Design a protein around this motif. Structure first.
Motif, PDB file in Angstrom:
ATOM      1  N   UNK A 180       0.859  -1.159  -0.248  1.00 31.35           N
ATOM      2  CA  UNK A 180       0.061  -0.111   0.082  1.00 31.35           C
ATOM      3  C   UNK A 180       0.889   1.253   0.033  1.00 31.35           C
ATOM      4  N   UNK A 181       0.635   2.187  -0.722  1.00 30.49           N
ATOM      5  CA  UNK A 181       1.175   3.334  -0.887  1.00 30.49           C
ATOM      6  C   UNK A 181       1.156   4.210   0.279  1.00 30.49           C
ATOM      7  N   UNK A 182       2.205   4.544   1.203  1.00 26.76           N
ATOM      8  CA  UNK A 182       2.153   5.350   2.344  1.00 26.76           C
ATOM      9  C   UNK A 182       1.982   6.777   1.924  1.00 26.76           C
ATOM     10  N   UNK A 183       1.108   7.322   3.006  1.00 27.02           N
ATOM     11  CA  UNK A 183       0.754   8.786   2.781  1.00 27.02           C
ATOM     12  C   UNK A 183      -0.515   8.854   1.455  1.00 27.02           C
ATOM     13  N   UNK A 184      -0.852   7.719   0.874  1.00 27.53           N
ATOM     14  CA  UNK A 184      -1.820   7.790  -0.108  1.00 27.53           C
ATOM     15  C   UNK A 184      -2.942   6.915   0.396  1.00 27.53           C
ATOM     16  N   UNK A 185      -2.699   5.976   1.215  1.00 22.28           N
ATOM     17  CA  UNK A 185      -3.424   4.786   1.700  1.00 22.28           C
ATOM     18  C   UNK A 185      -4.183   4.339   0.893  1.00 22.28           C
ATOM     19  N   UNK A 186      -3.645   4.278  -0.680  1.00 28.45           N
ATOM     20  CA  UNK A 186      -4.279   3.537  -1.648  1.00 28.45           C
ATOM     21  C   UNK A 186      -3.114   2.602  -2.199  1.00 28.45           C
TER      22      UNK A 186
END
Lengths: 243, 78, 151, 165, 209, 165, 165
Positions: free
Chosen positions: F74-80
């Motif tokens: 999961x992409x950090x600071x995007x939470x996607x």
């Protein structure tokens, strides 16, 4: 309303409450998640901050505490911590119906005496721990002014509760050290009263010893055998008076 | 709402007294610690003056206390 | 807050000092040291001349002094009655005793809060001023109420 | 022990588009279970009027256990099964592509035909000949669904389906 | 339709209960004055038993079977130890938890609905009031029962109809081990539970003036 | 023991285009696992609105062990689950190729037709003839997707699926 | 022990659209059952004249069991099996789409035809060429019916079907 039964019922008789109930239920479904987190974080912050402040204040006035809690003066002759005694007065117990048991005074041995190496300091009973926390894990946030305000007030309440908990823990530690010191001074008092046998110690000695590779000069062995305890022949008790 | 109204103001809270001290030499008529002497002779509580509310759960409204006595007021009707 | 009383019921230190100032400017002596309160009232302004009777207008003053006393928590209250040498010693002692009993009775009847009320009268056994010209007009003809506010 | 079909509250952290199934985890923030998390997936509906999440793999701390209570989500403060997102993602692009391709076709052909009664011819050229391939490709791609995506900072409520031990 | 009755009864019960309890508490001192338990405690901190009295009884079983007696007495609760006298509160005080959640599902919509809802709530609240009153009645009956039983025990003991309770105290000096000691251990144990005496030959009568 | 579906943090170093699958390695930098690494691969979605990474072969230092926990990222600071890359790679190239080929076809044919009502004829020649084969080849190649490519210096978070020991 | 097919009242708190069947829960508020909860789902009727809900998963508080009494619901204060919602969602939308597409086709073709007996030609162009694709798409999409959607704040009456213990 509910208290003023008839007034509240006649108020509910209008449909304004019947339309406000949905708009308040939709808020009552969700709001608790924010408030639980607010209480938790407030408790954390209050506990940590109060603990740090009280620790600083404690360290401020160590010297007087060190002077008053002189375990060294209480250490016995052979570097032995004296035992601990507890005494209760006017004891009564109803074990069950038809039968009761009472007594005037009772004495109990808390901790049997043993060897010591250093006089224990008050810090082992009083020094609060302190780990600064640096993890605000804020997931959800209030959206409007009402939830922001309730968030603020709940955080304040949590801070209050944390302060209370810290103060209570400090008080408990104070009680523990107080009762330890009281037990020691009680033992000294009773030993003066000549109602408890003093601890008894024997010593043995050997001169040089060892093989051709390892040697020692004077092997001295100190062993304590007769542990202090209460006597049962009260007739030998020497009374005391004042002037 | 000033406890030390028309006085010097709050100085601190004596816990042994559970009371605030005004800046002038008097104890305020407000409490600060819950471990004080408050003269209250009225309160609430179901299953009161018994073993308290028993932690059981009942499909009906029947509620009992740890002393074994029941309470219609604490329960519902039908 | 709505459950646990934040303060003792019907109390206000501002009201306390206000009524103390009003009493002092009325002239009835009010004082306190530590947590002990003592109030002195001249006998002339309360009773009729040489009689154990209460003047009718004095009921308002008694009412307001009871109202002030209601702003405190106490256990024991002591009342003493002192007068001037008039005819004898026994008669003066009886007069003081009756006055003290009457005032104590009315105070107890009113909504005061105490566990013990003590009352006694002495007369002119111990003055508090060398000036001894007047009789009931002399300031030493007094009634004193003393107590200690605890916690 | 959990009653069949009560309500719990949690927070969803990892957002995802309704395009590719994958594990999504939430964390129970209230109730008896604390520190517990839940992995699940999603589905795709025939119409984009709603969106729901499948949650099956519940992980509870304390003991090395892996319960499999399957449950779904109900929107707090709305009490509706839809998902808060945008649903008009891909209408305008396809409509414009189709209409422009058709307009090109028509302009080229009709303004070529109307010659009976150079730059005008070149405009006819471009419109008529580039309308057709564009129009057929637009008809090919016109059935692309308009997608939705959940949010990465929205809480949620979970209704139970079966019991546990 | 019936939620009206339910909520009315609940609110009425709560309100009446709170009012009666606070009135009782306001009228405090005379209650404890009249129900002075402690002065009736016997010498050895022993709660005296409770007596039940009845007069001119008769029971018919069937044809040619009727049993008639003049007076009867019974021991309700046997005497036993006590560390503090009971008060009026454990008999007269009744609990009160205020409800505040009338579940807003069936609400008044049309006028006749509102009117019938109001009247049903009113009658339900009256029902709650009278039910609370009846509960108070039962409490009063129970406490009067206990006090009267104590009084009757006293009177029978005076008339020399029930043996007084009997107790023995055994005292031991120093006791315990080298770690635990007690100065003087006193063991109090009761033997003779008070009971009626059938021997009428020692019965004593009294006459006033 | 790793709790079912907890969160770990790692840093990605090996970048690759979404064209050929290959072993991609990430390095666990914090938490319980220190110096550990994880090899895996990716997948390709029908729509390029995101990109997910499959991680299965986990290696921990210290002992000669090789666990096989399979997990995603999961992409950090995007939470996607989307990937930091580009998706507008090959729209304009094919659009322009098709449009130009069609326009050439039309120009040649229409200017030939309108001759009734020499270099102009030569332009007709070139446009009308070279348009057709170019247009059909452009239609043949029009379906090539716009690629994405991961980056060699982006950190990442990994949600677990099963436990380990 | 409940009589066959007797009457109870309940409250629905969670709303749902008649698009994706799923768990929906209600709570009994009066009668013998107090605070009991009920999970079920809905059905899709042949026509949009009504909507009914299936209620089968009955959970009684206190005891740890989940009975399977199946029951339906009726409209309180109306005594009907229909649903209180909107049913005119998608009539005029599809009607207007189809009619506009047809009008475009007709305008282009007929106003091109009537030439024998520039901006006018361009309008003819747009109508004639954008009518047809829109018309076939509208014929494709005209099959979508009008949906119903329950509310999150409606009470209900429930008739039973079988007995319980």
């Amino acid at each position: 309303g509910d208290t003023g039964s008839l007034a509240g019922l006649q108020a509910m008789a209008d449909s304004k409450y019947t339309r406000a109930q949905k708009k308040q239920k939709m808020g009552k479904i969700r709001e608790m998640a924010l408030k639980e987190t607010a209480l938790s974080v407030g408790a954390q912050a209050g506990l940590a901050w109060r603990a740090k402040i009280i620790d600083e204040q404690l360290n401020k006035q160590a010297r007087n505490l060190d002077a008053i809690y002189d375990f060294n003066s209480l250490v016995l002759e052979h570097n032995i911590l004296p035992p601990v005694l507890l005494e209760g007065r006017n004891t009564l117990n109803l074990a069950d119906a038809q039968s009761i048991r009472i007594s005037d005074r009772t004495y109990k041995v808390a901790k049997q005496a043993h060897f010591i190496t250093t006089p224990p300091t008050w810090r082992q009973y009083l020094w609060m721990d302190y780990v600064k926390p640096e993890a605000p894990n804020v997931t959800l946030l209030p959206k409007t002014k009402a939830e922001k305000e309730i968030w603020c007030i709940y955080t304040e309440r949590g801070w209050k509760n944390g302060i209370d908990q810290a103060n209570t823990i400090l008080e408990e530690n104070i009680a523990r050290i107080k009762e330890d010191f009281g037990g020691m001074i009680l033992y000294r008092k009773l030993l003066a009263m000549n109602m408890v046998s003093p601890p008894y110690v024997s010593h043995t000695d050997l001169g040089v010893t060892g093989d051709g590779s390892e040697i020692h000069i004077d092997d001295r062995v100190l062993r304590i055998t007769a542990l202090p305890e209460l006597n049962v022949n009260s007739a030998e008790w020497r009374a005391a008076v004042a002037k | 709402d000033g406890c030390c109204s028309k006085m010097g103001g709050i100085n601190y809270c004596d816990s042994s007294a559970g009371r605030l001290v005004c800046n002038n030499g008097f104890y305020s008529t407000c409490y600060c610690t819950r471990h004080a002497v408050m003269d209250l002779q009225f309160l609430m509580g179901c299953c009161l003056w018994h073993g308290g509310v028993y932690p059981q759960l009942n499909s009906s409204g029947l509620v009992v206390c740890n002393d074994g006595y029941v309470s219609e007021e604490c329960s519902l009707q039908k | 807050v709505p459950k646990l009383p934040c303060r003792v019921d019907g109390a206000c230190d501002a009201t306390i000092i206000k009524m103390m100032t009003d009493l002092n400017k009325k002239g009835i002596k009010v004082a306190s040291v530590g947590q002990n309160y003592l109030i002195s009232i001249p006998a002339s302004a309360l009773f009729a001349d040489q009689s154990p009777r209460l003047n009718w207008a004095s009921y308002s003053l008694l009412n307001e002094i009871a109202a002030f006393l209601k702003q405190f928590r106490k256990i024991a209250i002591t009342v003493t009655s002192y007068s001037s040498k008039y005819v004898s010693v026994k008669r003066e002692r009886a007069l003081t005793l009756a006055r003290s009993r009457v005032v104590s009775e009315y105070l107890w009847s009113q909504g005061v809060d105490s566990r013990i009320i003590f009352t006694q009268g002495l007369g002119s056994d111990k003055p508090i001023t060398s000036y001894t010209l007047g009789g009931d007009r002399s300031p030493n003809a007094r009634v004193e109420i003393t107590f200690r506010r605890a916690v | 022990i959990i009653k069949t079909g009560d309500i719990m509250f949690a927070v969803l952290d990892t957002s995802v588009n309704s395009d590719e199934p994958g594990p999504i985890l939430a964390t129970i923030v209230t109730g008896k279970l604390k520190g517990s998390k839940l992995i699940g997936s999603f589905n795709l509906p025939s119409n984009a009027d709603k969106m729901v999440i499948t949650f099956n793999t519940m992980s509870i701390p304390g003991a090395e256990k892996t319960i499999s209570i399957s449950a779904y989500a109900i929107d707090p403060n709305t009490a509706r099964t839809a998902l808060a997102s945008r649903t008009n993602h891909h209408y305008l692009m396809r409509y414009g592509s189709l209409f422009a391709s058709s307009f090109l076709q028509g302009f080229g052909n009709a303004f070529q035909s109307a010659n009976t009664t150079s730059t005008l011819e070149n405009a006819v050229i471009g419109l008529a000949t580039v309308g057709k391939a564009w129009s057929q490709q637009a008809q090919q791609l016109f059935n692309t669904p308009t997608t939705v995506e959940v949010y990465s900072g929205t809480g949620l409520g979970i209704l139970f389906t079966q019991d546990v031990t």
